[PDB]
C-alpha cells in the first residue's frame, strides 16, 4: 500500500485521475456498476474502493464514511495516489419548503459548520466547488430532465445539535446553534449535510477540483437519479 | 428622490432588474455608452448612475466606490429600487505567476478579508457567486476568445497591508497579514481586489444574484479593460 | 507631473509643505470646506478622492475626501501620509443614538467601537481606536470658542449603513445575529452615534505615529427614525486645524 | 427495527445496559466483547458495530464510533437515548513526548479541542474533561496489571494530517494555525494526538454523561508495529474491561 | 529584604525544601490554614501576597495567598515555581449554581470553564483548564477522611464577581450580551459553581509541568432563597480548609 | 456593617465622596491619603484598603484595587454602588519605548485590551478609552507639578510575565499569541505595560463612570526586564483637585 488507510497503490488506480466519493461503502459497487469493467480494489474501515472505466478512462469510486475527518483522510490519500477531481454523491433532506423529495441539489459552496475545513484554510476562505465540476453536474441534471436546485449547503460536524435538532437526550442546543436553522433558511441555504465543507475547502485550497450533487429524500419543513447524474457528470470531466 | 444615497427613484429605472457595477464613477458613462439609449440618472458622492437598454430591456450602470462599505450601500439601495442581478466589473492585478496582463478573471467565490460581509452573514458563510451569473460571464469570455481564469479571489478591506504591501509610510504589516500573500498563492487564489466579498455575501444571503469579472492590468509577481467590459455587457444580455 | 501615489494623483510639490489634512467623506464637500480658508486651490479629482489646498495663518493645509468606509479612507490616509501629512482631522455626518442629542449638534469622538474590517489590517481588535489627545483637545476647545452644542465621547464605527447600524427599513428587513439588538447595547454603554470611517482612521493613525481627530454633525436621531426627512462642525474643524498648525 | 436513527438498536437490545465501551474500529468490537461473559452480536450499520456482553451479572455494550467527532457524536447521542450513561473510549495511539514509549498506556484527563464537533455542544471555554470516576477506574485498572501508565492531556484533532502537523502529504503544506503546533503542544506536556476524544469528552461532560479514555501506545514519532501493536492492543483492552467492571 | 523573586519577598532558603504550596485567595486566611499544621511561621506579606511556612508530617509546606483573580494568581504561582514549588492546592469559597448543592458542601474541581483572560497567556482557548489527577485524587480521598458531602465536577472560572457570574444587583444593572442568560446555560451543562482563580491556576500549571488541584466550600447557593449568616459560613470554610491540609499530606 | 460585599464600607463612610483615587498596592493608600486633609482609615479587607480624605473641602476616597482586572472590577463596582462616579488610577509601569525614562510620568488615553475582565463589560470592539475630562485633568496637573510626561496608549495585560513577554521565568517561554508581541506594540507606539487599565477604562467608559489613568515609569523594558514615584502621585492628587 502506498497510503496509510486506503490500502491502495498508484498501480491499482490504473491511471485514474477522477474519483466519485459517496459516504456509504455499500453504495460503492452500485455506482461502479454503471460503468464498464467494475472491479473491487480494497476495503478498510469505512473506505471501500472500486475501479471502473468510463469511455476508456479508468475511474475510482471510494467511500468517505461519515463526517469531515474521515473524508479528509480519503481525499488526502486519493490525491497522493493521483486523483485530481472528486465528485461527491449523496442523499439529503432539505430546509426550504419549495424543495421537494425527488429534486436534485447541486452545491456551489458550503457554510462551514465543521472543524476539519479549518485544518486546510482559515474561515475567511470559501468552501467553494470547482466551476467545471458544478457545470458538469448541472448540465448532466438537465439532460435527464431532473428538477434541480443550485446553491448553498450547510455542512455540519453533527447530525443533531448543529442541524438544530431538539429531539435528543438532553433536548438542548448550544447558544451558537439556537435559532440557526431559521437563519440559514432566510439566507437561502438549501439543506444540511456533513462532509461538503471539508471536501470543498481542502480541494479548493490544494488545487484539486471538487463538486457535489445530492438527491432529496426528506424535508423536515414538510408533512438512482442522483447517481446517474454524477456518473454522467464524470464523463464530461475525464 | 427615494433612496438616501443614490438619489434615484423607482421610475428612474424604468423596470430595470439588472445592474452593472464598476468601482470608478468615471467608468460608468463609458460602460453605458456601449449600450442603447444611455442616459445619466444621478451623481452623488461616489455613486454615479446611468440607465441604458440592452435588447429592448432597461439596465442600470452604477458605481460602487472602493470597498465593501460603499458597495453595500449601492447594492442595498438598488435592490430597494428593484434590481435583482448585479454584475461587478473591475480592473485587477494578480498573484499567480502565470496570470498575464490582458487576462480576464471570473470569480467563483472570495476570501473574506473584509468587514462588511460580516454584517450580512457570519464568516462560515461562503462569499459565493451566483451560478447563472458566473456561467454567463464565462460563456461571454469564450465568445470573444479572451484568456480566462475562473476561481477564488481574495477580497481585502485595504489596498496596502491587507494585500501585504510593504512599500508604505510605516513599512509595517500587522501579524495577521505578514506572509499572507504567499499563503493565498499556495491556496490557488488568483488575485486581490476590494469589493467582491461584500458584494457576493450580501447577495448570496438575500436572494440576489451576483457575479464578478475583472481584467488584469498588472501582476504582483513581475511587478483589455475594454475586453472585460465587453464580457460584462455580453453576459448581461444573457441574464436579462 | 507623474503622481507620487497610486490613487490620489498628487505630488509632494502639490502639498506645498502641508502637514495637516482635513478629511470629509463626501468629495462634493471638499471645495466648500477649503473655501472657508485662504488661497483655496483645486489639486485633483480621482475616484472618490477630491483634493484641495488652502492656507491657514500662512500655513498650507490639505482638504481631501475619503469616500464612505474604512477601505477608501485607508487609501487616502496612507497616500496623504506618504506625501507628508502627519495630522488628520475627519469632519463627517452622523446618526445619533442618544435621545437628547439634537440634529445639528456637534459630536467629538474620543475613541470608536470597531465595527469595521479595515482597522484590523493595522492593529488587532484589542488595540483601541483612540483619537490623538492634541487633536481632540483642539476640537473641544474650538467648539467651546464658538459656543456650539457639543458632546464628547465614544462613537460606533460601522462597515455598513444598514444592518451594522441596525436599520430594518431595507430590502430584506433582516439584521444578522451579531447586530440584532446591537443599537440598544451601544446606547446603554453610552455610545453617542454611528458613522462609517472613524474606527479605521483612528486605528491606522494611532498605530502608525500619526495624529487624528474626529468630529461630526448630527443629521438624524436614531431613537426617532432610521432616515432623515431631509456647518457648525465645519467651522469647528477649521478652527481646530488652526490650533494644530 | 430500531429506536434510533443510525445504530439499528432498541432499548430491549441493551437489556438494561448503562455502560458502553467505545472503540473507533468496528473490527475491535467483537474482540473486546469476547473478554466478557455471554457476548453476542447486536447490529452493524455504517461504522457502528455493536455487541452486548455481561460483567458481574450486568449488561454492557461495546459499540464502534468510526473515525472522528462527527460519527462519534451520532453514536454517543443514540447510545444515550437507549440508556447509556457511561462511555469508555479505548484506542491505540502514537505519542508526542520523547519519554512515552511504545507499549505504554495513556489515560486522558482532558483534551485540547482541535475538532469542530465539540463546539456543537459547548463553547470553546468549556473543558473537554473526563469524568473523575472513569479516569480513576482506568488508572486503577492499569495499575492492577502493571502497565507503564501516563495520565494527562491529549490533543484531539479533526484531521490525521495537517492537524497533527504532518508534512508528508500531497500538498506538503500545513495551514498557519497548525504550523509549529506540535512543538507547542509538546512543550505544554500534551501526551498524544487522536481524533475522537474532544467530541466525546465535551458532549458527555456537558450533558451529564460520564466519559473516560484509555489508549495503548503503538508508535512514537519523536522516537523513530506488527506483533507489538497486537500485544499493546490486548493490554489496553484488558484495562478498559477491568475499568468497566469498577464502573457498573 | 533579600528576595529571589519580584513580588513575594521570598528566598529559596525560606522554603526549607518545600515543594507544595496551599494557595487561598484571601491573605487573612493564610495564618488560619497554617495553624492546622506544625510549627507555622510567617515569612512575608507584600501587596495581596501573605506567605507562611509550616510542617506537615515532617516536611515543609508553604501557604501563600493569591489575591482575587487570575492576574495576581499568575504572579504567585510563577514566583513560587521559581522558588521550587511544584504542587499547588487552591482552597476557596464559592457560590453554587446547582439546586442540589447545599451550603456546607465541598466541591472538588476536575476542570474549569475559562471565563478569564490570564489563562490565555499560557495556552490557547482549546487547551483544557484541567486539574492534576494526583491532586484531585488526594482531595477526593481527603474529603472521605474528613467526612463531607462532596461533589466533583466542572467549575466556571470568571474574571468578574458581578457580570461574569450574571449578577444584576449592580450599579448599572446590566450584563453584556456574552453573559446574558449564561448562568442557566452553565447550569444545564452541569457546572457546579463559580469562582475566580481556577481557570488561570489550572491552565498555567497543566501547561507547564506543575501539579494543581482545587477544593472549595459552598457559602451560598444562587438558586436558594435563604442566605446563610457570615457565622455559619465560617464553619464551611474551616471544613474545606481541613480537607486541603489532609490532601496535602498525600502529595508530599 | 457594610453596604457592599468586599470593601467593608457603608455609604455613610464616604461622607458624600464622588471621586476615588485607586492605586494597586494597599500599602500605598495611606501614603496618598496623607497628601490630603483630614485623612482617616476606613477599612481593610483582602487587597482592598480604603481611606477617606478631604480636598478643598470635599470628601475623597483612596482605595486599593489589588493587582489585575478582576480585583479592580470588584473595587470599582462596589465604590460605584456607594456613590463614586470618578476614578483616577495611579500605578507603576514598565516603559517599552526607548525614549521614555525611568521616573517619567505616563498618562493613558486608552489601552490595548490584553485582559479578560474588560470583556465582561463590553465586547472587544469597544475601546478601553479614558474620560476626556479626567485625561485633561491629569495632563494639566503634570504641568503644574513639573514632570517629564508622555500621553498615549498603554498595553494592559492580565499577566506580569508572559503577557508582557518576560522571559526571566520558570518556563522561559511565551505562548504563540505573545511571542514577539512587545516589539509589535513598540512599533505601534504603545508607551508601556501595566495590568489594571483595560478593565478600569472599559468598565467605566461603558457604564457612565469617569476614569483616568496615570503611572510612574519604574523600568524601561528596552534595557531591562526586572526593575529597577512621587511626581506621579502628586499629579493624581492635583488632578483630583480639578475634578471635584
Swiss-Prot record, chain D:
Give the pathway. Answer: Pyrimidine metabolism; UMP biosynthesis via salvage pathway; uracil from uridine (phosphorylase route): step 1/1
> Which Gene Ontology molecular-function terms are recorded?
uridine phosphorylase activity
Task: Give the family this protein belongs to, as stated in its UniProt record.
Answer: Belongs to the PNP/UDP phosphorylase family.
Task: Describe its assembly.
Answer: Homohexamer.
Please provide the Gene Ontology terms (biological process) for this protein: nucleoside catabolic process; nucleotide catabolic process; UMP salvage
Q: Which NCBIfam families match?
A: PRK11178.1 (NF008383), Uridine-psphlse (TIGR01718)
As for subcellular location, the record says:
Cytoplasm
Which Gene3D superfamilies does the UniProt entry name for this protein? Answer: Nucleoside phosphorylase domain
List GO terms (cellular component aspect): cytosol
Question: What PANTHER family would the database entry show?
Answer: FI09636P-RELATED, URIDINE PHOSPHORYLASE
Domain of life here? Bacteria
- Species the sequence originates in: Salmonella typhimurium (strain LT2 / SGSC1412 / ATCC 700720)
Enzyme Commission identifier(s): 2.4.2.3
**What functional role does this protein have?**
Catalyzes the reversible phosphorylytic cleavage of uridine to uracil and ribose-1-phosphate.
Matching entries from CDD domains are given as: UP_EcUdp-like (cd17767)
Name of the protein in question: Uridine phosphorylase
| Annotated Pfam families | PNP_UDP_1
Reactions mediated catalytically: uridine + phosphate = alpha-D-ribose 1-phosphate + uracil
What would be the name of the gene that encodes this protein?
udp
Provide this UniProt record's keywords sorted from A to Z: Cytoplasm, Glycosyltransferase, Transferase
UniProtKB/Swiss-Prot annotation, chain F:
Keywords, in A-Z order: Cytoplasm, Glycosyltransferase, Transferase
Query: Where does it live in the cell?
Result: Cytoplasm
Enzymatic reactions: uridine + phosphate = alpha-D-ribose 1-phosphate + uracil
Question: What's a Gene Ontology MF term here?
Answer: uridine phosphorylase activity
Give the EC number(s) under which this enzyme is classified.
Answer: 2.4.2.3
Domain of life according to the entry: Bacteria
Q: Which SUPFAM superfamilies match?
A: Purine and uridine phosphorylases (SSF53167)
Broadest EC class?
Answer: transferase
**Family of this protein:** Belongs to the PNP/UDP phosphorylase family.
**Cross-referenced NCBIfam families, in alphabetical order?**
PRK11178.1, Uridine-psphlse
Q: Quaternary structure?
A: Homohexamer.
**Protein role:** Catalyzes the reversible phosphorylytic cleavage of uridine to uracil and ribose-1-phosphate.
What is the name of the protein in this document? Answer: Uridine phosphorylase
Gene for this protein?
udp
Amino acid at each position: 500500500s502506498d497510503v496509510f488507510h486506503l490500502g491502495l497503490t498508484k498501480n491499482d488506480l490504473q491511471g485514474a485521475q477522477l474519483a466519485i466519493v459517496p459516504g456509504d461503502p455499500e453504495r460503492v459497487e452500485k455506482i461502479a456498476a454503471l460503468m464498464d469493467k467494475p472491479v473491487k480494489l480494497a476495503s478498510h474501515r469505512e473506505f471501500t474502493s472500486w475501479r471502473a472505466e468510463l469511455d476508456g478512462k479508468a475511474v475510482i469510486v471510494c467511500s468517505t464514511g461519515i463526517g469531515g475527518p474521515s473524508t479528509s483522510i480519503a481525499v488526502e490519500e486519493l490525491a497522493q495516489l493521483g486523483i485530481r477531481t472528486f465528485l461527491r454523491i449523496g442523499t439529503t433532506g432539505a430546509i426550504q419548503p419549495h424543495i421537494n423529495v425527488g429534486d436534485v441539489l447541486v452545491t456551489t459552496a458550503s457554510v462551514r459548520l465543521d472543524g476539519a475545513s479549518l485544518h486546510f484554510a482559515p474561515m475567511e476562505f470559501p468552501a467553494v466547488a470547482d466551476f467545471a465540476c458544478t457545470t458538469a453536474l448541472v448540465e448532466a441534471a438537465k439532460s435527464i430532465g431532473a428538477t434541480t436546485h443550485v446553491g448553498v449547503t450547510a455542512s455540519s460536524d453533527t447530525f443533531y445539535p448543529g442541524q438544530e435538532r431538539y429531539d435528543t437526550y438532553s433536548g438542548r442546543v448550544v447558544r451558537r446553534f439556537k435559532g440557526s436553522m431559521e437563519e440559514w433558511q432566510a439566507m437561502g441555504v438549501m439543506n444540511y449535510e456533513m462532509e461538503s465543507a471539508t471536501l470543498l475547502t481542502m480541494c479548493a485550497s490544494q488545487g484539486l477540483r471538487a463538486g457535489m450533487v445530492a438527491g432529496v429524500i426528506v424535508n423536515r419543513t414538510q408533512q438512482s437519479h442522483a447517481v446517474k447524474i454524477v456518473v454522467e457528470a464524470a464523463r464530461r470531466l475525464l
